[PDB]
RNA sequence: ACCUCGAUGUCGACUCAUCUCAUCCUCGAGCUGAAGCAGGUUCGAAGGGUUCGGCUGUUCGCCGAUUAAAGAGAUACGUG
RNA sequence: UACUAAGUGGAAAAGGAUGUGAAAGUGCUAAAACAGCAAGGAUGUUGGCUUAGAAGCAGCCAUCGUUUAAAGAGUGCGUAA
């Protein structure tokens, strides 16, 4: 949960998340990257849970890096409300993952533990993933 | 027995076979016995 | 048969040597009396299969890693292995290597010295 | 690979032609402990014990011009003993081994390269 | 709860009273008061009576006995035998040995008995002090 | 709010029940930190059985006595 | 013409799978490959420590050399060892 500090508005559009990736396909700092085969939405709590899970099993010399950040708000009006009458409140934060997007990159630690840990961390993500090797 | 949605040998000598389009795992230890996968 | 590493004095701490068919008391007395020449020495004592299986006992020719420990000017060994202890010379390594060359079945002097250095480079002492 | 195969064939042929009398028995109850004990029993005697594959040794014997080509193909755990220089100590050690062992069968070789039975070898190396 | 405070030193660092007032008993009356307050803050650690257990065993049922002793928070890494029978000495806490009596009795089929002697008082772990109060 | 307003009669108990299996019982089986009794969990099996009362109008629920158990639902939240 | 051997056809998931065919590259190998089987699987080495007694295989350090085609402070079980 990396909550934004200040925002110009409160209830904007969510996204048009189809089509190819606007970026994040490249791997910059890590040796193994976790790419996605399609796009969907990622809520804040899942990111924090996956990050603490991947860091707990991580050693004392490797380093990991996140390529995404929740920048979309969402409205979920309370239960039993009717359809219409304005807009609701913010309840969480959503990050947008287009097709062919890399979420995590890790380096500086043996590879087998890293592929195992990346599998165990991507199991916490809603979108099926794929391992991708370091780009020269 | 044991029923899961996926089977994987935690122990070494466990072998994987398919009988009647049903995947099973066999080990010398009875605790390493999964039947549905 | 029995594999164990105990002292060359009493046979009390041997529970398998006295479980194949060798009695404890009447033979621990024999071990204490006859082997009194080298009493108080860590020697692996073994027994072998025989027809009677009441007395068939031998001991390998004396290996003493404790002499390397005492030659390090210490009595309790170090948990680590990368700390120099004392100042050992080639004389002690030689007096241990030629001693244990009868226990190292490979009849090579320089290779025996190298093997003693290798088992000493993990002890935590370097030969000169 | 075949490169190391040819190199080892050359090496064994050289070491075979260097000596005059060479013998190779099996002794298939070989427990590495007894193997190295017999190795110690050799010591001070020129011969160096060794162990090589049966196919390459058969090829070496074929290229060494000595009778008894297919006799080495019999089952066993062959211990190659080609006496270094002085050869009487090697034969004495081999006869001490056969006395110590329950029974070891004649695999191949002879002293002065005229293959015969071990009965004569018992007379020579007693 | 009133647990025994044994062999504890007291050093009166500072004090003051009233010249024509401050009755003497109040001093000792105050002595228990403040000692409670900071005593609540101090979060004391316990001191358990550790004993020695000598068990003579024919060295044929020692597995169950050794496992039970290990489960009873003890230090065992071998045996010490009287040249024909093993009389093992184990450091034990008193808090659980009562059930351990019949557990050992049933584990060895009643073949092995023991004797209780007072060894000393030893420092407690946190798994004991978390049970100090409800 | 898409059928019904020149009629689609809603709660509850009573009688009669029927059907499904994520099984309450009886049945078989594995595993188990299952000595045995006794367990805990899972796997197939729905033919059969699935109590009586005091409280409030009653399902909800509490309590009492028990039973191999005192199933979870649907059928215009079954049937004027 | 090739495929599936499950009635998929004739309802789709996240996740598993010694399934099957297709292709790309790669090692070994008729001085006979991968296996089973028969022999071994040693030595300083209960290495040094931890622990009264834990030592190929409860815990940490080295996790090296020698006879060697070949042997790992060992791949696991087990024993308080």
Curated annotation (Swiss-Prot), chain A:
SUPFAM superfamilies: Ribosomal protein L16p/L10e (SSF54686)
Pfam families hit by this protein: Ribosomal_L16
InterPro entries, alphabetized: Ribosomal_uL16, Ribosomal_uL16_bact-type, Ribosomal_uL16_CS, Ribosomal_uL16_dom, Ribosomal_uL16_sf
KW rRNA-binding (keyword) present: yes
BP term (GO), one: translation
Keyword rRNA-binding annotated: yes
GO molecular function: rRNA binding; structural constituent of ribosome; tRNA binding
GO CC entries: cytosolic large ribosomal subunit
Keywords: Ribonucleoprotein, Ribosomal protein, RNA-binding, rRNA-binding, tRNA-binding
Superkingdom as given in the UniProt entry: Bacteria
Assembly, per entry: Part of the 50S ribosomal subunit.
Known role: Binds 23S rRNA and is also seen to make contacts with the A and possibly P site tRNAs.
Family: Belongs to the universal ribosomal protein uL16 family.
Record-linked PANTHER family: 50S/60S RIBOSOMAL PROTEIN L16, LARGE RIBOSOMAL SUBUNIT PROTEIN UL16M
Protein name: Large ribosomal subunit protein uL16
Curated annotation (Swiss-Prot), chain B:
Single Gene Ontology BP annotation: translation
Keywords: Ribonucleoprotein, Ribosomal protein
Pfam families associated with the record: Ribosomal_L36
Record InterPro entries: Ribosomal_bL36 (IPR000473), Ribosomal_bL36_sp (IPR035977)
Annotated family: Belongs to the bacterial ribosomal protein bL36 family.
Classification via NCBIfam families: rpmJ_bact
PANTHER family for the chain: 50S RIBOSOMAL PROTEIN L36, CHLOROPLASTIC, LARGE RIBOSOMAL SUBUNIT PROTEIN BL36C
UniProt protein name: Large ribosomal subunit protein bL36
Species of provenance: Mycoplasma pneumoniae (strain ATCC 29342 / M129 / Subtype 1)
Lineage of producing organism: Bacteria, Bacillati, Mycoplasmatota, Mycoplasmoidales, Mycoplasmoidaceae
Gene (name only): rpmJ
From Swiss-Prot, chain D:
Annotated keywords: Ribonucleoprotein, Ribosomal protein, RNA-binding, rRNA-binding
Stretches that traverse the bilayer: none
Keyword Ribonucleoprotein attached: yes
Keyword RNA-binding: yes
Source taxon at top rank: Bacteria
GO BP, one annotated term: translation
Descriptive protein name: Large ribosomal subunit protein uL10
Organism: Mycoplasma pneumoniae (strain ATCC 29342 / M129 / Subtype 1) (Mycoplasmoides pneumoniae)
Gene name per UniProt: rplJ
Residues of the full protein shown: 3 to 128 of 161
Swiss-Prot record, chain E:
Membrane-traversing stretches: none
Subcellular localization, as worded in the UniProt entry: Cytoplasm
Domain of life assignment: Bacteria
Protein family: Belongs to the TRAFAC class translation factor GTPase superfamily. Classic translation factor GTPase family. EF-G/EF-2 subfamily.
Function: Catalyzes the GTP-dependent ribosomal translocation step during translation elongation. During this step, the ribosome changes from the pre-translocational (PRE) to the post-translocational (POST) state as the newly formed A-site-bound peptidyl-tRNA and P-site-bound deacylated tRNA move to the P and E sites, respectively. Catalyzes the coordinated movement of the two tRNA molecules, the mRNA and conformational changes in the ribosome.
Annotated protein name in UniProt: Elongation factor G
Full-protein positions shown: 552 to 685 of 688
């Amino acid at each position: 949960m990396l909550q934004p500090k200040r925002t110009k508005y409160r209830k904007p559009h969510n996204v048009s998340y189809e089509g190819k990736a606007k970026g994040n396909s490249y791997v910059a700092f890590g040796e193994y990257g976790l790419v996605a085969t399609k796009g969907n939405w990622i809520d804040a709590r899942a990111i924090e849970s996956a990050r603490i899970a991947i860091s707990k099993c991580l050693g004392k010399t490797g380093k990991m890096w996140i390529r995404i950040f929740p920048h979309m708000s969402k409205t979920k009006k309370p239960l039993e409300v009717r359809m219409g009458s304005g807009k609701g409140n913010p309840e969480f934060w959503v990050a947008v993952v287009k097709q062919g997007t890399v979420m995590f990159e890790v380096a500086n630690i043996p590879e087998s533990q890293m592929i195992k840990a990346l599998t165990r961390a991507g199991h916490k993500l809603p979108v099926t993933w794929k391992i991708l090797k370091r780009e020269e | 027995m044991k029923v899961r949605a996926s089977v994987k040998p935690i122990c070494k000598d466990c072998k994987i076979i398919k009988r009647h389009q049903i995947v099973r795992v066999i080990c010398k230890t009875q605790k390493h016995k999964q039947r549905q996968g | 048969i029995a594999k164990i590493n105990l002292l060359g004095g009493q046979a009390k701490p041997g529970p398998a040597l006295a479980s194949v068919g060798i009695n404890m008391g009447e033979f621990t007395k024999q071990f204490n009396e006859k082997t009194k020449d080298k009493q108080g020495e860590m020697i692996p004592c073994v027994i072998t299969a025989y027809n009677d299986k009441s007395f068939d006992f031998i001991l390998k020719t004396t290996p003493v890693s404790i002499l390397l420990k005492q030659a390090a000017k210490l009595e309790k060994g170090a948990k680590n292995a990368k700390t120099i202890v004392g100042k050992i010379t080639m004389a002690k390594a030689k007096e241990i290597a030629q001693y244990k060359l009868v226990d190292l079945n490979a009849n090579t002097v320089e290779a025996a010295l190298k093997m003693v250095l290798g088992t000493a480079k993990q002890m935590g002492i370097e030969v000169i | 690979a075949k490169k190391d195969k040819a190199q080892q064939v050359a090496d064994v042929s050289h070491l075979l032609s260097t000596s005059a009398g060479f013998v190779i028995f099996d002794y298939t109850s070989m427990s590495a402990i007894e193997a190295t004990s017999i190795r110690k029993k050799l010591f001070k005697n020129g011969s160096k014990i060794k162990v090589i594959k049966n196919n390459i040794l058969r090829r070496a014997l074929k290229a060494g011009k000595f009778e008894g080509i297919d006799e080495t193909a019999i089952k066993g755990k062959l211990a190659v003993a080609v006496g270094v220089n002085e050869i009487v100590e090697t034969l004495k050690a081999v006869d001490g081994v056969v006395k110590a062992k329950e029974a070891m069968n004649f695999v191949c070789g002879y002293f002065d390269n005229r293959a015969f039975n071990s009965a004569d070898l018992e007379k020579i190396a007693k | 709860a009133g647990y025994p405070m044994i062999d504890i030193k007291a050093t009166l660092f500072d004090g003051s009273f009233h010249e024509v007032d401050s009755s003497e008993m109040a001093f000792k009356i105050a002595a228990s008061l403040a000692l409670k307050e900071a005593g609540k803050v101090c979060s004391p650690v316990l001191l358990e009576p550790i004993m020695a257990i000598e068990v003579t065993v024919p060295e044929q049922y020692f597995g169950d006995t050794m496992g039970d002793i290990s489960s009873r928070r003890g230090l065992i890494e071998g045996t010490e035998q009287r040249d024909n029978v093993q009389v093992i000495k184990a450091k034990v806490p008193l808090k659980e040995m009562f059930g351990y009596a019949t557990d050992l009795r049933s584990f060895s089929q009643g073949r092995g008995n023991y004797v209780m002697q007072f060894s000393h008082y030893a420092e407690t772990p946190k798994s004991v002090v978390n049970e100090i109060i409800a």
